[PDB]
Structures are given as structure tokens and as C-alpha cells.
Amino acid sequence: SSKMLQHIDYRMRCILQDGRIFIGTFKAFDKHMNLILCDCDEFRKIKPKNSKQAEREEKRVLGLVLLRGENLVSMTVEGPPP
């Protein structure tokens, strides 16, 4: 089917293999589960490493991101196409 093309051009968040999350407009895909994310932002959780320290998430914007399918784990929808 074409279930992967139905969520095209929308604000989707894909979970990486290392634990990061890339939220962006998934414009293009391929058979190898590649992703083209326009205005992408990667968020990685940092360890607290203490008893009273909280868990934070560092977020950095990259823009157009070409993500390979070997690092992508799962992708979820987050926002409509602007």
C-alpha cells in the first residue's frame, strides 16, 4: 500500500536509534526508510547523574535533514502541514 505517503509533508517526529527525536516536515521518503525533514529539530535527552537533578532535553535546529533508515526506529505524527 501507500501508508507511508499518506503522512507526507506533515510535521512528524521520528525516533532515532540512539534515543534522539527529530521533529520536522517529512517531505520525501524512499524504500530504504529514508526521511527528508524540512526545518528539522533534534532533541536528545541528557542524563541527570545525581539524586536531585532533573532530566532535560537539549534541542537543536538543523533545517533540512536527510536521515537514513538505519538509524530511524519509529515515526509519529505531531502537527499539520503549515
Partner: protein
Amino acid sequence: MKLVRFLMKLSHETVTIELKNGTQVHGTITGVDVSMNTHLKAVKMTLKNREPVQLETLSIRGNNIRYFILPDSLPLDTLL
């Protein structure tokens, strides 16, 4: 026979896909491909030592999935 054809003939079934990196997504599987790509709707995803979040739709890859959990009311003789 390949096991991908048995998983491709599954729609609107509340399954639980346990991923490789400590993730478990329980939801209704709406689409499966030959490359074991599971597109599900109304999923509850629990990561490794994290709170179970809820998503309206999810698309997990085939190589990232580790195991699956099917309901008890699912005949395996007709799907093979």
C-alpha cells in the same frame, strides 16, 4: 513460506510490538508491508524506564522491531 505474508494480512488488530531499544508500542495495527513496516493508530508507547505516552499514529520500521504480541483470539492456521 515467509512469515512476512502472515503479518501483512492483519488489520484493526490490537497488538503490542516490542522494539529493540527497550520500546513497546501497544496499538491497533492498520498497515503492514513486505519489509515488516508497521503503521498503527491510537498507540501507547512506553520506552526504556519512561512514562507511557499516547500517540494518534505511529510508523515503526521492520528492522527496529524485536518481537510482537498478538491477541488470544487470533487463529494462526488461517493466516499461514
